[PDB]
Amino acid sequence: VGSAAQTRAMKQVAGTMKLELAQYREVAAFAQFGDLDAATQQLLSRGVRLTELLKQGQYAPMAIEEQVAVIYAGVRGYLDKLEPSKITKFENAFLSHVISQHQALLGKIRADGKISEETDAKLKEIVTNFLAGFEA
Amino acid sequence: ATLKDITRRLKSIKNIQKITKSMKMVAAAKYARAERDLKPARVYGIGSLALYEKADIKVPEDKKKHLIIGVSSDRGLCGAIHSSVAKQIKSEVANLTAAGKEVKIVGVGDKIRGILHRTHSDQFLVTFKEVGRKPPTFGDASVIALELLNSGYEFDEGSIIFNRFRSVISYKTEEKPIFSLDTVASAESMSIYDDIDADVLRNYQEYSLANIIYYSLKESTTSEQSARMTAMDNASKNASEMIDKLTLTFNRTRQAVITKELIEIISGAAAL
Amino acid sequence: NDLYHEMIESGVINLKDATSKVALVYGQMNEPPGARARVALTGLTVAEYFRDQEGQDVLLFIDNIFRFTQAGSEVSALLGRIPSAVGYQPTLATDMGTMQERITTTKKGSITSVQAIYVPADDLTDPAPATTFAHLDATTVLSRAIAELGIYPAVDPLDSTSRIMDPNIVGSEHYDVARGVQKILQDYKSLQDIIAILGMDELSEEDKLTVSRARKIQRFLSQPFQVAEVFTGHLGKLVPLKETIKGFQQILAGEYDHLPEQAFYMVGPIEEAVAKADKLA
Amino acid sequence: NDLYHEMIESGVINLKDATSKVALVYGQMNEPPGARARVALTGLTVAEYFRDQEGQDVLLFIDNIFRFTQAGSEVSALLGRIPSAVGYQPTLATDMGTMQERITTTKKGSITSVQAIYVPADDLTDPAPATTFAHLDATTVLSRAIAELGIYPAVDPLDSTSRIMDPNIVGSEHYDVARGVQKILQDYKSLQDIIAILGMDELSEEDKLTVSRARKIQRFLSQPFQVAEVFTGHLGKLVPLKETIKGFQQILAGEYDHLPEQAFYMVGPIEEAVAKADKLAEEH
Amino acid sequence: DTPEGVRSGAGAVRDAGGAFGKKEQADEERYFRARAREQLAALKKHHENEISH
């Protein structure tokens, strides 16, 4: 970890993302589906969502705050309903929407280095609103 | 592909082969038992068949509802035993429900349930588990039929689907109609029948349902066991081919490793 | 000798007037090891002249560059050098780079180099083929197993790579199609073990779809070749890129799931595949 | 540097007073091969002084003794020796013994030595780790596969051995519990192969019970470490030997079969194990 | 038989790390993940019962 060589805002979502992805890896390695929605299908859907979130293109580095935003969007379950093959489109669209409209949010995240409760509430509003308005 | 990797894969496939062979033996024993009592079950089921064999009865033109009784086990590793039954059920529910008949499916066999749990879950009224683990008998069919009546669903038309045992290697997904409805059971064919009353006719159709469920289970269980034995034998054969190839690769790699270390040591010696 | 006479017939090598467009340098296996280690440099020099002095684009086709390295190993022992891994010369990387670096497009001219590289014992971890990978923009790896199944050409779909496979270069549609094909073939490879032991029966109906579609793609990758007409008896089919992209789109989507997989084998465009499918009545 | 600073704040090394309790000999990989082959000798010489001249008990902690052997392999060719198997120096066992025999508890004094041994490419058959096995009374092998499972520490339950593992020495109850744990884990290893083909919903109830108990034991093996508080995030725990024996004995008996497996992961005593289960139920 | 022949051991399927090993790993998790939920729910019911009494 580099003795806390990761920004606090990134840590907050990264810990849960790591745990969820570990659990998803442990359970979704069969491809021989039988029937446990609450336990497995819930977990593996979130794992697929987080993997699509992790997928990234070439020669397009993302700023740490934008990564925090997208990883937040995926890890809070807001994208669980989103289609697994449409997650990437949502990632790109949400990134653009945040950068353009809510650039102040990104600035605050970067300046503070930590997502406070108030910043979390702002992120909740942003993601929920865009997610509802994502598909016209 | 280190010798370590080749060894790991070879050992794993060897273990798989051993397990599959033992499983084939156990399935063979179970199939031997299931074929044994299939002969007593056979004539008993033929007794149920005789009803429509002699008193030829057909669904008039259409039934308001319908019942599809797809029988199977809960244990897989039996090729397409469950798959074939599920396919037949899907074809029928596609064939029906065009005329308006509301088909309902009782999934005796958690395998059948799961196969249709994600498409036809609504049509499932009740699904019966613990099928295939224990050799079926009439009392089991008694439970299934009784709970079917306890549901109260108006199964005017019924259909049972099962893999009838053809041979040790072949099975046929036969379908036998269940003209459970009293109206269809009382057709022109029974004009010449004397003592039969409507009440005891409904009772007779109920007992026929129970015993046809019994007969269907025995055929399916024998087919399932035979298929499982054959599949495990085939898996063992495939494992044998794979381990033969892997052993050849292992020998080549081992000799290569010895040669390579020899060459390294010789090169080190000469350089000195 | 075949290629020389074939080019003469085609007119690429005219023995009457100076309309010839191809020069030939030959260092065939009959030559001593020293000669085989320098003929590639001879062909490279005659290509270099056209690249720089004449300023004309050239296509340098070299056969078995591996033989250049192999010749070096044979003379390295007699040159008094401590043998390297396997037994190759200790200067494999340096001499190979010196040769390859000269075969490059410059600002004066362009040289499209098609170099065939033999892998010893069908082994790509061998030092000679392994080092060659770094000197190639596009790499095509033929596999014996694919040839055993009958698919010709035997290009390995999941091993061959290229540097122009960039969505901003080759196009988004093309990139997506290629990546999807590779993905479905990779998933089929991942399910190979379960298939090989248990049987295809013990798979999800979704998995069966992936297996069925992947096999159709593998068959459709095969293409009759014009130089292979005299071998297979089937006329070669030069398929335009757009047709390949569209056909693989259609196969990936599922439009031709009903068609048998055999109908996709040794065909040109997907239209020939559907025609063959109907023919298979 | 991390160790040096940590011991400074921990108090083991006092830069102000003269109550420091740990001496440091460091030759890192930045050092030349020759230096990396004698730092162990320097450290053990200091320990020997703390054993013979002063009749005290010493603790010699050496990291990656393997480097002692590897450094010799980097210079044997220049020294003029024909390479031995794999590539190590022909004087592997002799030099390793010459070093190791010095690190012992004489009748004058005791030296409890903990030596970390890097296993090249996770191959215990490699000559460097293989030779060092004979020189160590108690061996604890860390398996990568267990670490991939998440159990930390990744001690391999079926590979670690100690000479004092004797019912006469550790006690009958301790020995019985340990052997039972090892046996149940072996039987679980056997059962996994069956599982892969049959299916978990096909095994017998005895097989399912054995698998469940073995998984519970494997989870309970994991123990959060104080030094690993930074990594895991859980507070470090120290389990007394009596509590360890009691907890594993209870799990073997089956008294905690009703508790979920998760409750036994990254806990201290079985009291923490049962308490965690209640928290999950409250959060269920 | 002859000792020279390669001999397999318990756990080889999982040790290989192949498809069959991964299937065994996931299958064990899917079963006990569900079992833990049943066990946890039963513990919650037990806790509620003792709270009532």
XYZ file of N, CA, C and O in Angstrom, chain B residues 1-153:
612
model
N 5.406 -24.068 -20.338
C 4.806 -25.305 -19.849
C 5.829 -26.136 -19.090
O 6.376 -27.100 -19.620
N 6.087 -25.748 -17.844
C 7.058 -26.457 -17.027
C 6.597 -27.882 -16.754
O 5.402 -28.203 -16.816
N 7.575 -28.747 -16.474
C 7.269 -30.096 -16.017
C 6.335 -30.059 -14.815
O 5.494 -30.947 -14.648
N 6.470 -29.036 -13.968
C 5.553 -28.862 -12.845
C 4.113 -28.727 -13.327
O 3.208 -29.396 -12.818
N 3.887 -27.850 -14.309
C 2.544 -27.647 -14.842
C 2.000 -28.927 -15.464
O 0.840 -29.306 -15.237
N 2.827 -29.597 -16.274
C 2.386 -30.830 -16.920
C 2.021 -31.871 -15.874
O 0.999 -32.558 -15.989
N 2.848 -31.998 -14.835
C 2.580 -32.936 -13.753
C 1.268 -32.614 -13.057
O 0.474 -33.514 -12.759
N 1.037 -31.334 -12.759
C -0.194 -30.948 -12.076
C -1.412 -31.333 -12.902
O -2.358 -31.951 -12.389
N -1.399 -30.991 -14.191
C -2.538 -31.320 -15.042
C -2.727 -32.829 -15.137
O -3.856 -33.336 -15.065
N -1.626 -33.566 -15.301
C -1.703 -35.016 -15.422
C -2.305 -35.645 -14.172
O -3.190 -36.503 -14.259
N -1.836 -35.222 -12.994
C -2.371 -35.751 -11.743
C -3.852 -35.439 -11.602
O -4.641 -36.296 -11.177
N -4.247 -34.208 -11.941
C -5.650 -33.829 -11.828
C -6.525 -34.712 -12.707
O -7.563 -35.223 -12.262
N -6.120 -34.906 -13.963
C -6.926 -35.708 -14.877
C -6.941 -37.169 -14.442
O -7.945 -37.868 -14.617
N -5.838 -37.658 -13.873
C -5.831 -39.019 -13.342
C -6.860 -39.179 -12.227
O -7.613 -40.165 -12.191
N -6.902 -38.214 -11.305
C -7.897 -38.251 -10.234
C -9.310 -38.215 -10.801
O -10.202 -38.940 -10.341
N -9.529 -37.358 -11.799
C -10.835 -37.263 -12.444
C -11.227 -38.606 -13.048
O -12.375 -39.051 -12.927
N -10.280 -39.264 -13.720
C -10.543 -40.573 -14.311
C -10.961 -41.582 -13.251
O -11.947 -42.309 -13.421
N -10.210 -41.645 -12.148
C -10.538 -42.601 -11.091
C -11.938 -42.349 -10.543
O -12.739 -43.285 -10.377
N -12.247 -41.083 -10.259
C -13.545 -40.739 -9.685
C -14.664 -41.102 -10.652
O -15.690 -41.668 -10.256
N -14.486 -40.775 -11.932
C -15.506 -41.090 -12.925
C -15.710 -42.592 -13.059
O -16.839 -43.052 -13.246
N -14.632 -43.375 -12.991
C -14.776 -44.825 -13.090
C -15.580 -45.376 -11.918
O -16.493 -46.197 -12.097
N -15.255 -44.929 -10.701
C -16.022 -45.370 -9.537
C -17.483 -44.939 -9.646
O -18.399 -45.700 -9.295
N -17.717 -43.721 -10.137
C -19.078 -43.237 -10.329
C -19.821 -44.087 -11.349
O -21.017 -44.352 -11.194
N -19.128 -44.508 -12.408
C -19.724 -45.409 -13.386
C -20.130 -46.720 -12.734
O -21.205 -47.255 -13.017
N -19.275 -47.258 -11.865
C -19.622 -48.497 -11.172
C -20.889 -48.329 -10.335
O -21.801 -49.170 -10.378
N -20.964 -47.238 -9.570
C -22.130 -47.015 -8.711
C -23.391 -46.820 -9.547
O -24.461 -47.363 -9.231
N -23.292 -46.024 -10.614
C -24.425 -45.840 -11.511
C -24.843 -47.160 -12.139
O -26.032 -47.400 -12.351
N -23.875 -48.018 -12.467
C -24.196 -49.331 -13.013
C -25.002 -50.157 -12.021
O -25.981 -50.809 -12.395
N -24.602 -50.142 -10.749
C -25.364 -50.863 -9.730
C -26.785 -50.316 -9.614
O -27.766 -51.077 -9.585
N -26.914 -48.988 -9.549
C -28.235 -48.378 -9.426
C -29.102 -48.686 -10.640
O -30.300 -48.948 -10.504
N -28.515 -48.632 -11.838
C -29.234 -48.978 -13.059
C -29.663 -50.435 -13.055
O -30.746 -50.770 -13.545
N -28.801 -51.325 -12.563
C -29.168 -52.731 -12.470
C -30.386 -52.906 -11.577
O -31.290 -53.692 -11.883
N -30.420 -52.189 -10.453
C -31.604 -52.252 -9.599
C -32.826 -51.641 -10.282
O -33.928 -52.198 -10.213
N -32.649 -50.499 -10.951
C -33.780 -49.779 -11.532
C -34.391 -50.540 -12.703
O -35.606 -50.488 -12.923
N -33.557 -51.208 -13.499
C -34.065 -52.060 -14.567
C -34.806 -53.260 -13.995
O -35.775 -53.744 -14.591
N -34.359 -53.750 -12.836
C -34.959 -54.937 -12.239
C -36.429 -54.714 -11.907
O -37.289 -55.517 -12.286
N -36.741 -53.628 -11.203
C -38.123 -53.344 -10.838
C -38.873 -52.595 -11.929
O -40.093 -52.412 -11.816
N -38.176 -52.177 -12.987
C -38.865 -51.602 -14.133
C -39.778 -52.629 -14.782
O -40.846 -52.279 -15.287
N -39.376 -53.898 -14.782
C -40.250 -54.942 -15.310
C -41.548 -55.070 -14.517
O -42.624 -55.066 -15.140
N -41.543 -55.189 -13.179
C -42.821 -55.115 -12.443
C -43.587 -53.815 -12.649
O -44.820 -53.840 -12.751
N -42.895 -52.674 -12.700
C -43.593 -51.412 -12.929
C -44.237 -51.370 -14.312
O -45.233 -50.666 -14.518
N -43.655 -52.087 -15.276
C -44.078 -51.988 -16.669
C -45.531 -52.397 -16.855
O -46.339 -51.640 -17.399
N -45.875 -53.611 -16.423
C -47.236 -54.103 -16.615
C -48.221 -53.277 -15.798
O -49.363 -53.055 -16.215
N -47.799 -52.816 -14.618
C -48.661 -51.960 -13.810
C -49.001 -50.675 -14.559
O -50.153 -50.231 -14.564
N -48.005 -50.070 -15.208
C -48.276 -48.898 -16.029
C -49.128 -49.222 -17.242
O -49.976 -48.424 -17.652
N -48.902 -50.393 -17.842
C -49.719 -50.845 -18.963
C -51.179 -50.963 -18.547
O -52.088 -50.729 -19.353
N -51.426 -51.331 -17.291
C -52.790 -51.338 -16.786
C -53.443 -49.970 -16.862
O -54.608 -49.847 -17.248
N -52.704 -48.925 -16.486
C -53.206 -47.565 -16.661
C -53.414 -47.247 -18.134
O -54.412 -46.622 -18.512
N -52.471 -47.667 -18.977
C -52.554 -47.368 -20.404
C -53.804 -47.980 -21.023
O -54.411 -47.392 -21.928
N -54.201 -49.163 -20.543
C -55.309 -49.904 -21.138
C -56.583 -49.074 -21.221
O -57.375 -49.245 -22.156
N -56.796 -48.183 -20.251
C -57.950 -47.292 -20.237
C -58.189 -46.642 -21.595
O -59.219 -46.873 -22.236
N -57.227 -45.852 -22.065
C -57.343 -45.226 -23.372
C -56.890 -46.138 -24.503
O -57.161 -45.833 -25.669
N -56.206 -47.241 -24.193
C -55.868 -48.217 -25.221
C -57.129 -48.833 -25.818
O -57.277 -48.917 -27.042
N -58.054 -49.261 -24.960
C -59.315 -49.833 -25.411
C -60.425 -48.794 -25.513
O -61.087 -48.704 -26.552
N -60.652 -48.011 -24.459
C -61.602 -46.901 -24.508
C -60.892 -45.671 -25.073
O -60.444 -44.775 -24.354
N -60.772 -45.656 -26.401
C -60.094 -44.571 -27.098
C -60.720 -43.223 -26.754
O -61.862 -42.944 -27.137
N -59.978 -42.386 -26.034
C -60.451 -41.085 -25.578
C -59.480 -40.015 -26.054
O -58.261 -40.154 -25.900
N -60.026 -38.944 -26.623
C -59.249 -37.805 -27.080
C -59.859 -36.536 -26.509
O -61.065 -36.471 -26.259
N -59.011 -35.537 -26.284
C -59.470 -34.225 -25.835
C -60.464 -33.722 -26.874
O -60.159 -33.749 -28.075
N -61.669 -33.298 -26.466
C -62.708 -32.935 -27.442
C -62.231 -32.012 -28.554
O -62.085 -32.454 -29.699
N -61.998 -30.736 -28.247
C -61.295 -29.865 -29.185
C -60.302 -28.951 -28.476
O -59.304 -28.531 -29.072
N -60.556 -28.658 -27.203
C -59.819 -27.623 -26.494
C -60.168 -27.695 -25.015
O -61.306 -28.001 -24.655
N -59.181 -27.411 -24.169
C -59.360 -27.349 -22.727
C -58.995 -25.960 -22.230
O -58.064 -25.331 -22.744
N -59.746 -25.478 -21.238
C -59.487 -24.151 -20.689
C -58.077 -24.054 -20.119
O -57.381 -23.053 -20.329
N -57.640 -25.082 -19.404
C -56.310 -25.136 -18.812
C -55.585 -26.386 -19.312
O -56.108 -27.151 -20.126
N -54.368 -26.591 -18.812
C -53.600 -27.780 -19.156
C -52.526 -27.998 -18.101
O -52.043 -27.047 -17.482
N -52.157 -29.260 -17.910
C -51.101 -29.643 -16.982
C -50.025 -30.409 -17.734
O -50.331 -31.351 -18.473
N -48.772 -30.001 -17.552
C -47.623 -30.690 -18.130
C -46.780 -31.229 -16.982
O -46.204 -30.458 -16.205
N -46.704 -32.550 -16.876
C -45.986 -33.213 -15.791
C -44.670 -33.726 -16.367
O -44.581 -34.844 -16.875
N -43.628 -32.907 -16.276
C -42.308 -33.335 -16.701
C -41.528 -33.970 -15.570
O -41.142 -33.283 -14.619
N -41.290 -35.276 -15.650
C -40.632 -36.014 -14.580
C -39.153 -36.152 -14.905
O -38.764 -36.297 -16.073
N -38.325 -36.060 -13.870
C -36.879 -36.203 -13.980
C -36.308 -36.215 -12.570
O -37.023 -36.004 -11.588
N -35.009 -36.460 -12.488
C -34.309 -36.478 -11.217
C -33.760 -35.093 -10.891
O -33.819 -34.162 -11.694
N -33.231 -34.962 -9.677
C -32.531 -33.753 -9.271
C -31.026 -33.848 -9.478
O -30.334 -32.834 -9.348
N -30.509 -35.032 -9.797
C -29.083 -35.249 -9.992
C -28.764 -35.245 -11.478
O -29.364 -36.002 -12.247
N -27.805 -34.414 -11.875
C -27.432 -34.328 -13.274
C -26.455 -35.406 -13.691
O -26.600 -36.567 -13.295
N -25.452 -35.026 -14.483
C -24.451 -35.957 -15.005
C -25.110 -37.152 -15.688
O -24.689 -38.301 -15.537
N -26.164 -36.872 -16.444
C -26.910 -37.912 -17.137
C -27.201 -37.450 -18.562
O -28.289 -37.644 -19.101
N -26.203 -36.840 -19.195
C -26.374 -36.373 -20.559
C -27.537 -35.412 -20.673
O -27.639 -34.427 -19.930
N -28.442 -35.705 -21.607
C -29.569 -34.835 -21.917
C -30.890 -35.361 -21.362
O -31.953 -34.990 -21.865
N -30.842 -36.237 -20.356
C -32.047 -36.777 -19.731
C -32.977 -35.645 -19.312
O -34.151 -35.619 -19.698
N -32.458 -34.692 -18.532
C -33.269 -33.546 -18.131
C -33.479 -32.589 -19.294
O -34.570 -32.028 -19.458
N -32.435 -32.383 -20.099
C -32.505 -31.435 -21.203
C -33.595 -31.820 -22.196
O -34.353 -30.964 -22.662
N -33.672 -33.104 -22.550
C -34.680 -33.547 -23.511
C -36.090 -33.304 -22.983
O -36.967 -32.825 -23.713
N -36.326 -33.632 -21.711
C -37.641 -33.415 -21.110
C -37.987 -31.933 -21.110
O -39.113 -31.537 -21.435
N -37.024 -31.093 -20.733
C -37.265 -29.657 -20.729
C -37.589 -29.154 -22.129
O -38.468 -28.301 -22.304
N -36.880 -29.665 -23.137
C -37.143 -29.283 -24.520
C -38.554 -29.669 -24.940
O -39.249 -28.898 -25.611
N -38.982 -30.880 -24.581
C -40.332 -31.319 -24.920
C -41.378 -30.443 -24.241
O -42.392 -30.076 -24.848
N -41.147 -30.107 -22.970
C -42.059 -29.224 -22.247
C -42.140 -27.867 -22.935
O -43.223 -27.291 -23.086
N -40.988 -27.321 -23.328
C -40.979 -26.022 -23.996
C -41.710 -26.081 -25.332
O -42.455 -25.159 -25.683
N -41.510 -27.158 -26.090
C -42.207 -27.308 -27.362
C -43.714 -27.383 -27.150
O -44.491 -26.792 -27.908
N -44.146 -28.115 -26.121
C -45.578 -28.240 -25.867
C -46.183 -26.915 -25.413
O -47.227 -26.495 -25.926
N -45.542 -26.234 -24.458
C -46.063 -24.945 -24.004
C -46.069 -23.942 -25.150
O -46.905 -23.032 -25.195
N -45.125 -24.080 -26.085
C -45.204 -23.312 -27.322
C -46.340 -23.815 -28.204
O -47.097 -23.016 -28.769
N -46.474 -25.138 -28.332
C -47.575 -25.704 -29.103
C -48.918 -25.334 -28.491
O -49.863 -24.974 -29.202
N -49.025 -25.414 -27.173
C -50.236 -24.975 -26.501
C -50.115 -23.477 -26.225
O -49.177 -22.827 -26.692
N -51.090 -22.906 -25.513
C -51.132 -21.493 -25.131
C -51.328 -20.603 -26.354
O -51.507 -19.388 -26.222
N -51.261 -21.193 -27.551
C -51.726 -20.507 -28.749
C -53.243 -20.588 -28.866
O -53.898 -19.631 -29.296
N -53.816 -21.729 -28.484
C -55.261 -21.923 -28.486
C -55.936 -21.305 -27.271
O -57.166 -21.345 -27.180
N -55.164 -20.752 -26.337
C -55.689 -20.159 -25.134
C -55.589 -21.037 -23.905
O -55.744 -20.532 -22.787
N -55.337 -22.331 -24.085
C -55.232 -23.249 -22.958
C -54.092 -22.836 -22.034
O -52.931 -22.778 -22.451
N -54.431 -22.558 -20.779
C -53.460 -22.129 -19.777
C -52.701 -23.354 -19.285
O -53.202 -24.120 -18.458
N -51.497 -23.556 -19.801
C -50.692 -24.696 -19.382
C -50.045 -24.390 -18.041
O -49.642 -23.254 -17.762
N -49.987 -25.403 -17.188
C -49.256 -25.340 -15.937
C -48.324 -26.540 -15.875
O -48.648 -27.619 -16.375
N -47.152 -26.344 -15.279
C -46.110 -27.361 -15.265
C -45.774 -27.703 -13.820
O -45.492 -26.812 -13.013
N -45.825 -28.991 -13.493
C -45.370 -29.494 -12.204
C -43.998 -30.114 -12.428
O -43.870 -31.156 -13.079
N -42.966 -29.465 -11.904
C -41.612 -29.901 -12.154
C -41.101 -30.945 -11.185
O -40.263 -30.637 -10.332
N -41.607 -32.175 -11.281
C -40.954 -33.272 -10.579
C -39.553 -33.409 -11.153
O -39.372 -33.754 -12.329
N -38.555 -33.117 -10.328
C -37.204 -32.898 -10.796
C -36.772 -31.451 -10.653
O -37.188 -30.575 -11.424
N -35.924 -31.193 -9.654
C -35.381 -29.853 -9.488
C -34.578 -29.433 -10.706
O -34.441 -28.238 -10.973
N -34.027 -30.398 -11.444
C -33.367 -30.081 -12.706
C -34.347 -29.462 -13.695
O -34.053 -28.432 -14.312
N -35.517 -30.082 -13.860
C -36.545 -29.520 -14.733
C -36.952 -28.140 -14.240
O -37.069 -27.182 -15.021
N -37.153 -28.016 -12.927
C -37.498 -26.720 -12.354
C -36.461 -25.671 -12.734
O -36.792 -24.654 -13.347
N -35.189 -25.939 -12.436
C -34.135 -24.975 -12.713
C -34.022 -24.624 -14.182
O -33.819 -23.461 -14.541
N -34.134 -25.627 -15.055
C -34.073 -25.355 -16.486
C -35.187 -24.402 -16.890
O -34.976 -23.478 -17.685
N -36.389 -24.602 -16.352
C -37.498 -23.711 -16.657
C -37.787 -22.702 -15.552
O -38.804 -22.005 -15.621
N -36.930 -22.610 -14.532
C -37.136 -21.620 -13.479
C -36.937 -20.196 -13.970
O -37.467 -19.261 -13.361
N -36.175 -20.000 -15.042
C -35.859 -18.660 -15.512
C -36.685 -18.242 -16.718
O -36.619 -17.078 -17.120
N -37.468 -19.152 -17.292
C -38.340 -18.801 -18.405
C -39.806 -19.010 -18.045
O -40.632 -18.114 -18.242
N -40.138 -20.193 -17.524
C -41.517 -20.591 -17.267
C -41.829 -20.724 -15.778
O -42.643 -21.571 -15.393
N -41.197 -19.906 -14.932
C -41.404 -20.027 -13.491
C -42.862 -19.804 -13.108
O -43.370 -20.434 -12.173
N -43.549 -18.902 -13.813
C -44.954 -18.646 -13.516
C -45.802 -19.896 -13.722
O -46.683 -20.200 -12.909
N -45.551 -20.634 -14.807
C -46.345 -21.823 -15.095
C -46.160 -22.901 -14.033
O -47.031 -23.764 -13.869
N -45.037 -22.882 -13.319
C -44.818 -23.843 -12.247
C -45.819 -23.630 -11.121
O -45.834 -22.571 -10.488
N -46.652 -24.639 -10.863
C -47.515 -24.603 -9.688
C -46.780 -25.124 -8.459
O -46.601 -24.397 -7.477
N -46.349 -26.380 -8.507
C -45.605 -27.008 -7.424
C -44.506 -27.865 -8.033
O -44.727 -28.559 -9.031
N -43.319 -27.807 -7.438
C -42.182 -28.608 -7.869
C -41.785 -29.552 -6.745
O -41.684 -29.136 -5.587
N -41.572 -30.819 -7.086
C -41.263 -31.852 -6.109
C -39.780 -32.193 -6.168
O -39.250 -32.503 -7.240
N -39.121 -32.133 -5.014
C -37.698 -32.403 -4.890
C -37.477 -33.826 -4.386
O -38.416 -34.619 -4.258
N -36.216 -34.152 -4.090
C -35.819 -35.482 -3.622
C -36.242 -36.570 -4.607
O -36.731 -37.631 -4.216
N -36.045 -36.305 -5.895
C -36.369 -37.245 -6.959
C -35.066 -37.717 -7.584
O -34.221 -36.901 -7.964
N -34.901 -39.038 -7.684
C -33.713 -39.646 -8.229
C -32.738 -40.148 -7.181
O -32.069 -41.163 -7.406
N -32.644 -39.459 -6.042
C -31.791 -39.931 -4.959
C -32.244 -41.296 -4.461
O -31.422 -42.193 -4.243
N -33.542 -41.475 -4.295
C -34.100 -42.738 -3.862
C -34.934 -43.355 -4.975
O -35.661 -42.636 -5.670
N -34.843 -44.666 -5.173
C -35.661 -45.327 -6.193
C -37.132 -45.014 -5.991
O -37.674 -45.213 -4.894
N -37.808 -44.515 -7.022
C -39.208 -44.115 -6.859
C -40.117 -45.312 -6.635
O -39.821 -46.436 -7.048
N -41.235 -45.053 -5.961
C -42.260 -46.061 -5.738
C -43.623 -45.387 -5.809
O -43.730 -44.170 -5.981
N -44.674 -46.203 -5.690
C -46.032 -45.683 -5.819
C -46.320 -44.622 -4.766
O -46.927 -43.586 -5.067
N -45.899 -44.866 -3.523
C -46.157 -43.909 -2.458
C -45.615 -42.530 -2.772
O -46.237 -41.516 -2.457
N -44.432 -42.476 -3.385
C -43.900 -41.203 -3.854
C -44.834 -40.578 -4.879
O -45.205 -39.402 -4.773
N -45.235 -41.365 -5.877
C -46.236 -40.902 -6.827
C -47.541 -40.577 -6.117
O -48.258 -39.655 -6.517
N -47.878 -41.343 -5.076
C -49.036 -41.009 -4.254
C -48.912 -39.601 -3.689
O -49.853 -38.807 -3.763
N -47.752 -39.274 -3.120
C -47.546 -37.936 -2.569
C -47.693 -36.885 -3.662
O -48.381 -35.871 -3.487
N -47.052 -37.119 -4.810
C -47.075 -36.143 -5.898
C -48.506 -35.898 -6.365
O -48.964 -34.752 -6.451
N -49.239 -36.975 -6.650
C -50.608 -36.845 -7.138
C -51.518 -36.223 -6.089
O -52.342 -35.358 -6.408
N -51.387 -36.647 -4.831
C -52.231 -36.112 -3.769
C -52.019 -34.615 -3.605
O -52.983 -33.846 -3.514
N -50.757 -34.178 -3.569
C -50.490 -32.746 -3.489
C -50.998 -32.034 -4.734
O -51.449 -30.885 -4.661
N -50.930 -32.699 -5.889
C -51.488 -32.120 -7.105
C -52.981 -31.864 -6.952
O -53.481 -30.804 -7.348
N -53.712 -32.822 -6.377
C -55.117 -32.584 -6.064
C -55.268 -31.540 -4.968
O -56.179 -30.705 -5.021
N -54.395 -31.582 -3.958
C -54.466 -30.611 -2.872
C -54.280 -29.187 -3.376
O -54.756 -28.238 -2.743
N -53.583 -29.017 -4.503
C -53.459 -27.694 -5.103
C -54.820 -27.149 -5.515
O -55.073 -25.942 -5.416
N -55.708 -28.022 -5.987
C -57.024 -27.618 -6.431
C -57.078 -27.063 -7.835
O -58.168 -26.708 -8.300
N -55.941 -26.974 -8.521
C -55.913 -26.465 -9.885
C -56.728 -27.361 -10.809
O -56.617 -28.588 -10.763
